[PDB]
Amino acid sequence: SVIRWCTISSPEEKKCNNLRDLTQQERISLTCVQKATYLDCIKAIANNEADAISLDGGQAFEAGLAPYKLKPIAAEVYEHTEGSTTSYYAVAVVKKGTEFTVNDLQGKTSCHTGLGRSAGWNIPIGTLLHRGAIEWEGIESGSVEQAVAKFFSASCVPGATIEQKLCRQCKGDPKTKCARNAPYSGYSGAFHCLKDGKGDVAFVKHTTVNENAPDQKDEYELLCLDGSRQPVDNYKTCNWARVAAHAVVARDDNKVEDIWSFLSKAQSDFGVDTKSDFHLFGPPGKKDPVLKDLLFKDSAIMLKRVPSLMDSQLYLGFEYYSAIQSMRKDQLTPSPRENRIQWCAVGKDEKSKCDRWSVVSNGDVECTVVDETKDCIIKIMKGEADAVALDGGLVYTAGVCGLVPVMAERYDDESQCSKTDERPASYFAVAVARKDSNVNWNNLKGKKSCHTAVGRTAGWVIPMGLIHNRTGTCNFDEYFSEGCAPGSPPNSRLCQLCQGSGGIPPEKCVASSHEKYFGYTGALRCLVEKGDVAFIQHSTVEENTGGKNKADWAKNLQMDDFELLCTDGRRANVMDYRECNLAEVPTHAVVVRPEKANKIRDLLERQEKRFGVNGSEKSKFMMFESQNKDLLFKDLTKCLFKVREGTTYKEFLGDKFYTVISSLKTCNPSDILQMCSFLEGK
């Protein structure tokens, strides 16, 4: 196509154009739209007049807000000693020998990169708001601009519309001087501000003294939040925050595909290892402040692509996003919560059981309904729901996204969740077949398979990881004729035995209880009315036979109709899961953000007293009851036990299990796993 990069200063526009000419005879090409501001570029990308632009984390928060809904497409990478992550560190630079601490900043003069930028404004002013030095309570006590103008004696905050005091130390002419591209703008202009004696403090990133005064580094210090002062190189132990990198945003559409093609071209041709006169990232030399950080920051070394599930809210993190909002609303007022556990139900039957839970607890629990169980993960990460109970396979995924197992399911007896005088708790993964059949473990190829869902412990992680040991492929779709493994791609072989809903919009091969064949009992039902194997839990056959499941298909079933398949030998008795299983796996657990673990552990124990297996109001509601549909919780559950504080998903899951998912993930990784893997490697 011709990618329309938006620029915001006449030097940037000028660089934009040298790249138009070096790419002018290529497949993906370029134009360089120049507007007066970065917001004027956000509007032009939202109105199809330009296509891309790289924005500071605080401006990436604005681009993602409606009407605009602009997405993170690409992210800058920085030289890290850890790795080379897509984040940087905000630091506050002062001169060696001035005596003040972070506690003495009142009355001083300050130099900021820009109003609303992360290191230059959001992190310092938000941090001072929270320590109690800048006194702001919420928008009803003034703007943040008025609150800072009473703290600092004069500042240069190139962006300030309201207070004139924030433009007083700025350098340049009577109109242009307090603009976002003025000489004292950006990380280096704010550094020159300090170097020229105009600020006592400069709020910049961890690389700024090295980008503008490398031999003069010994004349400068950093202000640490513990009251101390350290050297400019000790930023890793003396920073104010680690923030998300600057990111290339764009309209969420087909053009995205080309914006990355173009950028991966110039990364390869014009990067850090280049020999041309065109440098895309840099070079980071001492230079005029106005020629610094054009189009991309001089500190970038390459671009990394953000996975498509991401949105600004998700890119910036819960802690930082919640900070930019703080500075837009009074604290008491939208902040009551710790009295209500917002549970996340998946699909319609789980929505029904949760609304009764919410009616019968006179409100102590409320419900969010989603469609897939990956949506619950995202809702909890964003602070829009608080807990959900997930399977061992799906706890791995939440564990990569930073959620923690706070309570887990105990499948044996009711009194056993009070334990000193025993520890552990697990269930078993199993291969079930009908006794008439010819199939055994090694006969398993080219057959029909029934799976609880793609992604889950017993019905996919254990079986596919043993078929992946032998097969050496991540194409289990070619290892059967067909199956029903809900959640797979809709037009494949593992979708064909699946039935769908009643059959109204029909929804087959979906990962909720709308699909007939979903979960442990839906996959016994697949074995029974259509397939060769059912990859299930050890008790799925006892629970649905001997007359206990009173549905059509299950009315007549007895446990003599089936047999297990051991990794090898025989076929075995369905009640010998101990000796003929595929694995002993950890149980299902409730996973929450680490800071909400206290509330919901306590709010959930109150709830099981009233509706647990020996609840006091069982009569109205029993929590681990669903009609063999394992709604909200598994039906086998006798009680729920507390998982000790500071337990990591890896420790809960066990090392034996931790290994298996870290084998199948070289095979096709889900879009949620990839997104969260960008954030843990951020």
Residues near Fe ion (CB under 5 A) are 56, 118, 391, 457
Q: Report the chain's C-alpha Rg in angstroms.
A: 29
> Which residues are CB-contacts of 432 (< 8 A; sequence separation ≥ 6)?
524, 527, 533, 534, 535, 536, 540, 541, 562, 563, 564, 565, 574
Rounded Cα gap, residues 603 and 338, in angstroms = 9
- Closer residue to Fe ion, CB minimum distance, 28 or 661: 661
Instruction: Show the tokens assigned to 228.
Output: 């101390």
117 is in an annotated binding site: yes
Location of structure tokens 């879009």:
671
246 is in an annotated binding site: yes
DSSP, collapsed to helix, strand or coil, labels residue 111 as strand
Location of structure tokens 């029993």:
622
Q: How far is the CB of 423 from Fe ion (least distance, A)?
A: 20
Q: How far is the CB of 262 from Fe ion (least distance, A)?
A: 23
Question: Residue 334, preceding bond cis, omega within 30 degrees?
Answer: no
Q: How far is the CB of 391 from Fe ion (least distance, A)?
A: 4
187 is in an annotated binding site: yes
Rounded Cα gap, residues 363 and 341, in angstroms = 9
- Closer residue to Fe ion, CB minimum distance, 316 or 385: 316
427 is in an annotated binding site: yes
Q: How far is the CB of 384 from Fe ion (least distance, A)?
A: 25
> Which residues are CB-contacts of 542 (< 8 A; sequence separation ≥ 6)?
559, 574, 575
411 is in an annotated binding site: no
- Closer residue to Fe ion, CB minimum distance, 145 or 391: 391
Rounded Cα gap, residues 513 and 519, in angstroms = 8
Total Cβ atoms within 10 A of residue 415:
11
Give helix then strand counts, H and E, for the chain: 20, 26
- Closer residue to Fe ion, CB minimum distance, 3 or 56: 56
456 is in an annotated binding site: yes
- Closer residue to Fe ion, CB minimum distance, 3 or 119: 119
DSSP summary character for residue 457:
I
- Closer residue to Fe ion, CB minimum distance, 118 or 212: 118
Q: How far is the CB of 43 from Fe ion (least distance, A)?
A: 21
279 is in an annotated binding site: no
452 is in an annotated binding site: yes
113 is in an annotated binding site: yes
User: What's the sign of the alpha-carbon dihedral 364, 368, 374, 375?
Assistant: negative
Q: How far is the CB of 283 from Fe ion (least distance, A)?
A: 19
Give the C-alpha distances (Å, rounded to integers) separating 419 from 415, 423, 642, 643.
Answer: 9, 6, 10, 11
Supply the DSSP string of 546-600, one letter for each residue.
Answer: TT-S-STTTSS--TTSEEEE-SSS-EE-TT-TTTS-SEEEEPPEEEE-TTTHHHH
- Closer residue to Fe ion, CB minimum distance, 169 or 457: 457
Q: How far is the CB of 77 from Fe ion (least distance, A)?
A: 14
Give the C-alpha distances (Å, rounded to integers) separating 427 from 412, 430, 559, 588, 659.
Answer: 9, 10, 19, 9, 18
- Closer residue to Fe ion, CB minimum distance, 12 or 56: 56
Supply the DSSP string of 408-449, one letter for each residue.
Answer: EEE-S-GGGSS-SS----EEEEEEEEETT----TTT-TTSEE
- Closer residue to Fe ion, CB minimum distance, 262 or 520: 520
658 is in an annotated binding site: no
Q: How far is the CB of 426 from Fe ion (least distance, A)?
A: 11
Instruction: Show the tokens assigned to 333.
Output: 């007022």
Q: How far is the CB of 213 from Fe ion (least distance, A)?
A: 19
SS3 track for 258-323: HHHHHHHHHHHHHCCCCCCCCCCCCCCCCCCHHHCCCCCCCCCCEEEECCCCCCHHHHCCHHHHHH
534 in Cβ contact with 432 (< 8 Å): yes
Q: How far is the CB of 648 from Fe ion (least distance, A)?
A: 20
- Closer residue to Fe ion, CB minimum distance, 358 or 586: 586
Binding residues for hydrogencarbonate: 113, 117, 119-120, 452, 456, 458-459
Binding residues: 56, 88, 113, 117, 119-120, 187, 246, 391, 427, 452, 456, 458-459, 520, 588
Binding residues for Fe(3+): 56, 88, 187, 246, 391, 427, 520, 588
